[PDB]
Amino acid sequence: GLGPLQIWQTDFTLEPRMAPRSWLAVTVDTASSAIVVTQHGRVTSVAAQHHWATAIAVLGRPKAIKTDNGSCFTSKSTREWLARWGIAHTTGIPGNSQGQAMVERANRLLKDKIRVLAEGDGFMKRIPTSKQGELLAKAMYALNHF
């Protein structure tokens, strides 16, 4: 059968409404356009690995993951975690090309959706910590399943 390769794009984006764990790791599966998001307190190699561990459970094992050159992505620790799994790690193409547009678009939509849902629940600033998990899951659902 002919179809798209299982290649992911992953990035981190800061969302203060979700503080203290305001670092959102976002993965777009370019083959299905599915979006997986998890929240973290810091942008470390270990946060990137925990995110992908969750994404693999949800989406399955990809052939390759495209990131920018953030240190959590280029560290020895992360290089070794990806090798343990047999996942190729790659980056942006030259030729005046940018990092990864699909995942940057997803960052924006995600942040828009979080704001819309939070304000509907009456949270004009930071979402109360005990409400964050379900609101994030509701944002992911809306971005994925119609």
Added chain:
Amino acid sequence: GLGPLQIWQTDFTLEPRMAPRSWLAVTVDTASSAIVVTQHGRVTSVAAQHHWATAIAVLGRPKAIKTDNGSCFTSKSTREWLARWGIAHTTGIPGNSQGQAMVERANRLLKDKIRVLAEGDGFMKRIPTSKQGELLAKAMYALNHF
């Protein structure tokens, strides 16, 4: 098109290897046989709701969820959370029938898989807390994607 109805079965099972959060919530989608599992410190109405919030993000919104008559499932809080989402909540059929066999089978396979992976990593008893999340995600992946 003709296919199966989107009906889930959900249950809790105790797994001391995953302590202090040793309560595993397990949902089987009867339509795809997909399995979603999350871990919790206690079996409360709020734990059940956080699990389903995650399952909805992963699997989409089901038409109905079958549980046994555990109190976390039959409380007012949980009845109201399911109504907010528009999800029917149902239970086992009479006629000498048991609770929900598919989800009970999944409970067993999950616990077998956790044990196999833990012992391979050298953990004969409780899995160190910082290792639990990725090991659980690896168990879910193996039970789902081949």
